[PDB]
Amino acid sequence: YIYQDSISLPWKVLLVMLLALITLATTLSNAFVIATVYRTRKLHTPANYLIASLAVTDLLVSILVMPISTMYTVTGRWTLGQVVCDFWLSSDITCCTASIWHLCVIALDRYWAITDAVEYSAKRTPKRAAVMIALVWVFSISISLPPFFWVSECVVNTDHILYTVYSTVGAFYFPTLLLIALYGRIYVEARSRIADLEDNWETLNDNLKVIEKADNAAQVKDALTKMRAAALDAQKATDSPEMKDFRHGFDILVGQIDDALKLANEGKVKEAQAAAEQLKTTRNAYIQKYLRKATKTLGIILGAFIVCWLPFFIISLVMPICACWFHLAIFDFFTWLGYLNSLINPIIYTMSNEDFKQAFHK
Amino acid sequence: DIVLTQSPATLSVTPGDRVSLSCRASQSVSNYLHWYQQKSHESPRLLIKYASQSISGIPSRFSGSGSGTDFTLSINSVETEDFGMYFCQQSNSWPLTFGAGTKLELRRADAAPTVSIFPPSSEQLTSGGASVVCFLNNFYPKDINVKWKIDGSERQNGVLNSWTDQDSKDSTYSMSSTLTLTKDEYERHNSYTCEATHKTSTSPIVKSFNRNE
Amino acid sequence: QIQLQQSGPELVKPGASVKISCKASGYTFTDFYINWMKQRPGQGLEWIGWIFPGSGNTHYNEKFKGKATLIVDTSSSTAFMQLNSLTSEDSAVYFCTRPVSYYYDFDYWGQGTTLTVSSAKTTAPSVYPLAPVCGSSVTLGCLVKGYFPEPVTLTWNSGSLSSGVHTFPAVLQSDLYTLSSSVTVTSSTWPSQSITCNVAHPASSTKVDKKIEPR
Ligand SMILES: CN1C[C@H](C(=O)N[C@]2(C)O[C@@]3(O)[C@@H]4CCCN4C(=O)[C@H](Cc4ccccc4)N3C2=O)C=C2c3cccc4[nH]cc(c34)C[C@H]21
């Protein structure tokens, strides 16, 4: 007895489609993502090498696992024999462990970038980022070795239980306690920084009003030396070409504060007040460019990673414990929900990241 | 960049009349808007700064109103000295931007032009060049059409027209037209005709001469 | 007597550069922003940029970024703008101006400087007098033909007669300028008293008096 046996051939030709059309959309979405990076030298970044390295594993799953997941899922048996299904399992288990852990190494980059901006930009390289893809492809294999030691029924060793729980801890719970701890850190920095920056513009605006309606030099001085402190901070908030243009606009803002200050120090209050009038002009113009998506979008990867892989890994632990009102259709349905992760990852990075959306539309 | 759309492009007023010049900003510029007069190329005279502030020495007949995107310069009773280009500039944000102008032109009784013709000087002829010069002077309104004829029928090529801005005092306009020929083509012909076409008259205003004199 | 005295007009070859002047007087030159403006015959003005003389700091309109460089010589209390790699789209009028402040009763402009960007060779004008063909008023005139660059200065009887005078704008035709001027006087005054149009083209250091006399 296998449940599939009582599902007629009308539904079986509609269930060759969806799993042929899900398999295909994984190959040509993750290949459109590698060739986007392969085909751009501004996109040749240490953090866009990882996205490709990710899409690389999700491309392996789409050709090694997904088309030969279906001849088993549709019928309910296994035609291809012993020497085959030992390295069919090995791929599925590791290639989906790679897929998961690559989401950690991506979130290690974001974390160390947004937390140690200055110092880790030197360690951040291709070579240091090649170590990461590698040591996650090596550790991934080190999970599928344990069952290798120990007809028509392809499945993995559920006799040793210590393996069962180690396999689900080393490739899932660690990676989601880690994801939750990094996204925690990141969201709190990323939210403090806009607050810090909001306090900077609040100072620069509050103090301008002080100068406008000021009766003497002394208070114009203290007010201009506060905008300066504040401008010179905003300038450090967020290599060489793009950013250059952003900082230059502050180097005007600052120079106007400097020229005012001089007149304030020379005792020329009315002169300073005029000199400061130019500042509103400059504030007014860098109000558009003040008025956080990189951090919003990793909330969709966490979300679409939780929703995809949690069920399979929960249901993977109470099965060997507990049919406790359990149908092998629900263990098969949440196996495709975790394969679906290898689809959803590329399609979030086109709506999210603005360099894959300049690519696709062409 | 902030676009200041001035309306209307051109405006005709009778002295006495009330006039509202409009200046519309593509986005808010708060009260950072100023108004200028420019009679010609001469450097602009600031009429009104910061929308409502009026400038020392500018006459009382000029005044400003507005905030956000809709601005109005206002001449409660336009005088004769008031022709020219009215220009709004914003200083809300960089870069400073102007409007394209409202061109303010005054009315006055009509006047057909005093038309004078002038053959070539003995001097121009002794360098083998021939220029027939026609002045049409002190007419209103400004639109006018000159046409040249050598011995009956129309000549386009070689013609050069110029025009004065509207006059300070009598509010009238003036034009020069110059037909330039080769000394040969000059004295290969006899009758030279400067036909002018103005609102003051349906059939045209025709001045002429012949070389034989 | 606060004043901004800009430099004179300049013929210049396309590809070349120019320096324009703004000598400032009667206020501490170093205490106030200065702006530079461009205006072409039929059009609004555009802002090029400002400098702060006391420091030489500058902002520029993206539009004019590589074109204009504003500098300043504090010691002669003057301001310069250097335009570079010039083109036909550069012939226009250039004004420096102290901007308009909330805190000061007026603003202040230079008289303008007029750049002419061409390969055309400077040429001194021929000046033909225009007499009547042989009537309470009589109208004489004065053709000024085949010069470049602008300007010419025209007057009647070394400046004495300005009333009832119409001097028309200059007009290009294949790299030469025609200008003209009419003068209308009573039948009694001419030919009694001599009428003479005076024509200066400073680019050719050319002064030319022609006394209108009857054909
Ligand atoms: C997506 N991929 C699926 C793949 C798999 O279950 N493939 C089989 C062939 O399909 C089954 O689901 C079938 C279908 C319905 C009932 N079935 C079973 O009885 C057993 C369940 C089982 C799971 C674990 C241990 C013993 C038995 N199945 C199988 O083994 C193994 C994975 C895995 C196992 C261990 C660690 C892992 N990390 C990432 C992964 C993974 C990726 C993950």
Residue numbers in the entry:
A (entry chain A): 38 to 187, 196 to 283, 293 to 345, 350 to 380, 383 to 422
B (entry chain L): 1 to 213
C (entry chain H): 1 to 134, 139 to 219
Please, what does the article write about this entry?
All GPCRs have conserved seven-pass transmembrane helices (TM 1–7) that are connected by three extracellular loops (ECL 1–3) and three intracellular loops (ICL 1–3). We discovered a new anti-BRIL antibody (SRP2070Fab), which promoted crystallisation of ICL BRIL-fused GPCRs. SRP2070Fab perpendicularly bound to the BRIL helices. Based on our results, SRP2070Fab appears to promote crystallisation by affecting crystal packing.
The constructs, 5HT1B-BRIL/ergotamine (ERG) and AT2R-BRIL/[Sar1, Ile8]-Angiotensin II (s-Ang II), were complexed with SRP2070Fab (the Fab fragment of SRP2070) for crystallography experiments. For 5HT1B-BRIL/ERG/SRP2070Fab, diffracting crystals grew within 1 week in 400 mM KSCN, 100 mM NaOAc pH 5.5, and 30% PEG 400. Superimpositions of these structures showed that SRP2070Fab bound to BRIL had very little influence on the GPCR structures; i.e., the root mean square deviations (RMSDs) within the transmembrane regions of the GPCRs were 0.55 Å for 5HT1B-BRIL/ERG and 0.67 Å for AT2R-BRIL/s-Ang II between equivalent Cα atoms. In 5HT1B-BRIL/ERG/SRP2070Fab crystal, the accessible surface areas (ASA) buried due to crystal packing were 2,206.9 Å2 (5HT1B), 713.4 Å2 (BRIL), and 2,225.2 Å2 (SRP2070Fab). For 5HT1B-BRIL/ERG/SRP2070Fab, the overlapping layers of SRP2070Fab formed strong crystal packing by interacting at multiple sites. On the other hand, it is very difficult to state clearly whether the 5HT1B-BRIL/ERG/SRP2070Fab and 5HT1B-BRIL/ERG show an active or an inactive form. However, the orientation of TM6 helixes of 5HT1B-BRIL/ERG/SRP2070Fab showed more similar to that of carazolol bound β2AR than that of 5HT2B-BRIL/ERG. Based on these comparisons, the 5HT1B-BRIL/ERG/SRP2070Fab structure adopts an intermediate active state similar to that of the reported SRP2070Fab-free 5HT1B-BRIL/ERG structure. This is especially apparent based on the orientation of this intracellular region of TM6, which adopts a conformation observed in the inactive structure rather than active 5HT2B structure.
